[PDB]
Amino acid sequence: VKQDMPPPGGYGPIDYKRNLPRRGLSGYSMFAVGIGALIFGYW
Amino acid sequence: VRPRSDVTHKQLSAFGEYVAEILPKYVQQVQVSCLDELEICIHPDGVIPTLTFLRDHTNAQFKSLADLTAVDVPTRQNRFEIVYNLLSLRFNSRIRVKTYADELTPIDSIVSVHIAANWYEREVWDMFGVFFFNHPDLRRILTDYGFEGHPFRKDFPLTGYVELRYDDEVKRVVAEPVELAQEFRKFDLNSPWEAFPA
Amino acid sequence: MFFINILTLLVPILIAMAFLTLVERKILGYMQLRKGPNIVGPYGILQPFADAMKLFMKEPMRPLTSMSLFIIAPTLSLTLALSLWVPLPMPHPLINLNLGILFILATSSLSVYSILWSGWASNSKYSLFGALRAVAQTISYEVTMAIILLSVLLMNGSYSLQTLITTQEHMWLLLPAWPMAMMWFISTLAETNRAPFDLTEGESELVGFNVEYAAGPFALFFMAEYTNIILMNALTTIIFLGPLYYINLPELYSTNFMMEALLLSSTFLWIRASYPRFRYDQLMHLLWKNFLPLTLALCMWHISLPIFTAGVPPYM
Amino acid sequence: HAVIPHGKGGRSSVSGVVATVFGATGFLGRYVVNHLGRMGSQVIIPYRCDVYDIMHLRLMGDLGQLTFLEWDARDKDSIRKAVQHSNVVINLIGREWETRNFDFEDVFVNIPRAIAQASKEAGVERFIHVSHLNASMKSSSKSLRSKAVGEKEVRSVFPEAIIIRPSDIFGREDRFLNHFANYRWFLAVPLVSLGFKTVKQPVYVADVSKGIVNATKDPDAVGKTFAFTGPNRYLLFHLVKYIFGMTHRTFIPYPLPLFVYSWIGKLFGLSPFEPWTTKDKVERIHISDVMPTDLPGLEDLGVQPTPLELKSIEVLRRHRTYRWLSSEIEETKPAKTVNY
Amino acid sequence: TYKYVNKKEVDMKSATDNAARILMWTELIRGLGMTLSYLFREPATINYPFEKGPLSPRFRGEHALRRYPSGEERCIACKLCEAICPAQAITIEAEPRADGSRRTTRYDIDMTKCIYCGFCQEACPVDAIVEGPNFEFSTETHEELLYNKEKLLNNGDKWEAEIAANIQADYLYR
Amino acid sequence: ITHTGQVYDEKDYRRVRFVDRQKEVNENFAIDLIAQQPVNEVEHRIIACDGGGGALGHPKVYINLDKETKTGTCGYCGLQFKQ
Amino acid sequence: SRAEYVVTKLDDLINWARRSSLWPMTFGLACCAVEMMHMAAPRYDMDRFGVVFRASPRQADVMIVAGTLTNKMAPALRKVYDQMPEPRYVVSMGSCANGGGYYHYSYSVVRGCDRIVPVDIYVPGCPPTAEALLYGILQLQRKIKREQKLKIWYRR
Amino acid sequence: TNMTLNFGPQHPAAHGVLRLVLELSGEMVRKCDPHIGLLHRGTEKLIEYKTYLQALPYFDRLDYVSMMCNEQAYSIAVEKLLNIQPPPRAQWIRVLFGEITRILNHIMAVTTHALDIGAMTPFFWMFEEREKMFEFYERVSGARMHAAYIRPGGVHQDLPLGLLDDIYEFSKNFSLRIDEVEEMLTNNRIWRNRTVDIGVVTAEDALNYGFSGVMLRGSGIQWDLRKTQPYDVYDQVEFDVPIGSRGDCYDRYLCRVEEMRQSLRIIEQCLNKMPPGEIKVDDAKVSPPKRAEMKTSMESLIHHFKLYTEGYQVPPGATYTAIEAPKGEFGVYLVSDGSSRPYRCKIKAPGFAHLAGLDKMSKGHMLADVVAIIGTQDIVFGEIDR
Ligand SMILES: NC(=O)C1=CN([C@@H]2O[C@H](COP(=O)(O)OP(=O)(O)OC[C@H]3O[C@@H](n4cnc5c(N)ncnc54)[C@H](OP(=O)(O)O)[C@@H]3O)[C@@H](O)[C@H]2O)C=CC1
Ligand SMILES: COC1=C(OC)C(=O)C(CC=C(C)C)=C(C)C1=O
Ligand code: SF4
């Protein structure tokens, strides 16, 4: 007799948006660590 | 009861006259059905002209061809009833233009008006046998390469006349006249009592 | 003895070659939320032996085709790949060759034929189209592959792979020359027709020489590819990642060679699952446009770094 | 006991012939089951080969038309149950290489007797026994002689049992035609008497099959010893070359004494896996086809023989090369017919 | 309401940022991280013979004919299960059993013809034909798949306990 | 053998099928099972027969057990009712 | 030492190798293909059992015909069946390919694939459940286990 | 013949069965003539011989990736002809399972696209989510796919007692699963290349060739039949059509990932606002009577017997009703005599039009490009072949 229905007060909220995180080492910093490695290696 | 919006029934009716006046020559009957749709019926010669007016008229732009089909009323002298359903993305609406074609009296092709029809017209030839003049490449699309007969015609047996099996002797697939192991049981379903039309 | 040293260095690699397919069909699995093959044997250890036996038993259909450029092709593929492990310098090598890297470069180059011969032998369109493209990127990649090594050698002093164990006693050649490592790694991915660069076995594209190859011939190339997959990774683990060498105990060299080779072998497995396959021209666009100008210029930098840094390497 | 024949004539129709066919897996057999299945007959195929091999026969039979029974020649009980519910028994049991556990007697005379013997006990209306053509009780090849021995015996176990006696058969998957064509591997193709004086008359497999089937459904054949022969005879020379002709492979007919050659057959015979040539085969190959003076087979039983050249192209095509694979028989030259 | 999925200065910081993205393959490394992450997640596969993928009561599975607790088969040959079968699978012919009652002499569901719609489950007034839970009835030969009354009645007897539980759970819904 | 005694016969050309494979027949044939069912005695002239369980039974019918001469039998369950 | 024993054991090995690693070549005609992609997918991993995700018409041990075998596709099915190795098998999947299914009486549908390719295991169900296919693939594995090719050679 | 080469029917790259007789000058495609009908099965003729309710299962099979959404189109069509409309709860259900089905189709289209491209891990990641969805179907209909749940007068049976809660847990998480695929393909330095600027279709040309789907939306034409011509209660929900610019394989993809996102927004609402009520019209004339009723009331048995044995008896007329199936506009032109069995039922397949465009899209393109474009049209040969 009971009918499956949304719970009282409604369900909670869902995410409908991409949550892709723009996380990265900044480019200059990235290149500097690399060039520094080659300089040490060459020496 | 469906939620009919008379607002529509009227506006589409009004367009139906509009088209009927604009092309007195080919429009034979124009009617707005209860579902609330509109169907302008045209002489087969008006295939090119009526479509083009709908594809390229500011007050009636019907850019895409939803479908091209051919019901087959065997009783009707002109057996096939080519039906073209068109959609207006701008004014938002749909109109169906339906013509009549007999087996050996071909209809013009509208591949020019809408290139969508390049395939559907091949589909109508393969299934029903109507021929479309000026078609770029009319050739069977859905049926087998060697199929004989047009299948969706009401006069074609469902099971058909040929079926395929592999024969060892000839080591190749081979047609044979259809022999079915349980024929389609043809239940008669119509009731001898009608329903007093509302 | 020397014969025993041929069993070792071969069998051991063949047994390991079999266990790579397994560690490929499980690492790709767990990355894709699936156990992979564990039901045959314990944890799938008997799985590689099982299909080997199925492959050899199934009919080696000879198409209605050459019969030699067809059987020479897998024999050549397995022969060159297993052969290139002969001079590899794990601790100390089996056959130490003074011009060792030229041996490895030359032997690799010969494998491109097997692809050409198999494609012509099949005599079906999918095979010929696949072979011509496959031969094209293999030799295209060979050109940067070779120049990248020449840059290395000039900082090693010799062509012998044994010298690098003495060159890399203080630092890996990745620190210096990392820019080429990456370019050696990507070229190692192309030359083993692995994923990012695998249009040859491209299935959606040309379902391709292996198309007509089934059972025993399929297996031999097959074996070849995977052994190569290891060998090239192992060459990365000697030329650029130099395992620590102690003259007193030679096996910690091989122990670390074991660890680095497995991880970089794991990496191309990980690359495969992670990336879509490049387009045929997109692949050559990379080598001739993106990498060859980088390699040729960095090649000159490696003829200059020695001279003006008064670091010309000691021959011998 | 019978089954009124209803239907239009194709698959999913009924003809009323329930027939045990013990050696169906064979080259001839395959064809026998084909027509029997096409006609709609009930076919019981006894088998001792593995189920994977028997699969090819499943598809030509309609649903429920083909029943497969496990059977062992040494075990009499297996033959007993196979013919329990059959009314027609066809025997095609034969081999060319005497196998370790089965001698020419067994495959030709011993077994084919027990079979018909039971068939009678069962009450099968008719039994068709197949023995090689020109089979004297004194013929050189043990095979042919032994086969002759059988056709006699089975009479006594089963009287009025039809005995079709086919010549070597021409068909795809046959030996007569493929064997010679496969001599390619051999650089030279030995031919006793340089392939002369052993005129041979091939017969298409189907013709043989159709004939056999027609026997099952005809009262005229009882105790008849038909001989399906062919539409044209041939000196072995043209045959060999013709074959090589369609195969488009060179021909070097080399004389080699049958004496020494019987030895070559012995060599292959020695091989464990299905010897390719058989001392007996060699002899049989040279045994000249006998002329026809017996109960007519084909045509007599209702099928007009089919010339060899007509279908040869299909049988020998697999043996051609990359390009030769595209040549057709009419641009090719058909070899001359020597009736002798 | 619409949305622009892909609708679109040059600064060293910006460019250097962009050039590093092309030169050291930064985004490619991002993708590798995702797959390494799952490698560490628990795999979702089930030991198929030992553990079975869950099917709730309405699963249609394999046809069975039920019987009354007394032992009288439920079907009374009204034959509308035949009428509504979309594939023409069920063939029923009937005659009055000596008892005088109405029963089916032959009830043949051709399972290869059947497309497991579950309408027969729906249509039966006595609910004699039910969609049984079992889905594992793969057969070596085509003939075995054709099912007569005796196989279905036998199928019904074997799975009656679960069929009764399943119908018990879902009948209020229907 | 079976319910309606299907007996592919010693001379049929179909009994060939069971060779080496058994036939599907039924124990506890239903023909006798309701006959084994006791006659449901009732007080009222007419009685119902939900088949037992309402929705899980048969379309309910009312049987007239009005003549002891005959025990009404619901056409659906074959259950005889003894007035 | 009795060769007979020696033979059985050997056969078994052979059977174990083919039965452990069956590389299926699937056609995906129709939809029952979607229910096989599910098998390949993580809940019911086909690979775990040694079945490879997919292979070409050559390197394939078993062909799973999923979906309607229409009259135009019927010549192809055969070709590909005929282009596979000497030890080959066919697992018909779907009522549309076991028999004719919802489209049995149509003019363009072959009433079953076993009219064009010999079929070894018939998996029933309109979308035969993926578990059911897995059951069907496992029954092919028991069918292979029982095959005794070398013992018949020895006893022949 | 410029080395004409049948793409071949058996090809992992060709979804289902597609012979693309292509003439390629080396690795460049000069002309693509797709062949169809390798899966024609007669669905349109068979329906004429079947009653309305026994033709409902055919629609699930027409394009079975999108199992239900197709059923809604026939439902709507049969409801219009009868001038009956489903009860309020049924409408929300159809939108609930209508959307779940859209996700299922997009997970199929995006992941199968990648498998042909060569990325294989996205398929396994999302097929597990698919699997979980199927289970919803099964616990609502009984079948994993090919349910037959949405019938011409509403749905067949109310949702099980508890489904809504689970269609929540899943929805609450699925997003992250779409997000992951993204971190794998949206910005891959390589996905973009093989997809960007491949198969660009102009806006005017897309309308002209009748594309009507994401393919139009991807070119920037704004048309979602769900917003322009609302069907069911897709009017009461609020979602954003994901329009695209620089239409190309990559842009449309992004659109399909965005509708996966927008459908989660529509599913959420449906769970939040689904009404208490009945799930089938109360006209025993069109909807079959409840089994307790047919077993206790004579008028209900008569209505059960006639409905199952004979049929609806739809009033004579004809209608073209189109919904927004995941692939594009799916429409049924159902001509109907007064009889219980239809007279014609042309199924408009978003896909017959899209394939035709393959020629005008893949011009001067490499063999690999053709593989990418068949993917960006989500061709399911069932709908095209019908
Ligand atoms: N051209 C020809 O082949 C000619 C043939 N004949 C006769 O016609 C008959 C049919 O010829 P063909 O089909 O080519 O012969 P095959 O060599 O093909 O063998 C026929 C069948 O007999 C079975 N068989 C063989 N030995 C035994 C045995 N010991 N126990 C049980 N079964 C056995 C074989 O089954 P399996 O292999 O599974 O054991 C095979 O399927 C032969 O008996 C032959 O004497 C006459 C003239 C010409
Ligand atoms: C989306 O359409 C597709 C199918 O239709 C259901 C397939 O069967 C198949 C074939 C399935 C396998 C597992 C090869 C593919 C590849 C496909 O893309
Ligand atoms: S409907 Fe139920 S009762 Fe009536 S016949 Fe079919 S099965 Fe027997």
Ligand code: SF4
């Ligand atoms: S069987 Fe049912 S599911 Fe498999 S294809 Fe035919 S219809 Fe689609």
Ligand SMILES: [Zn+2]
């Ligand atoms: Zn009752």
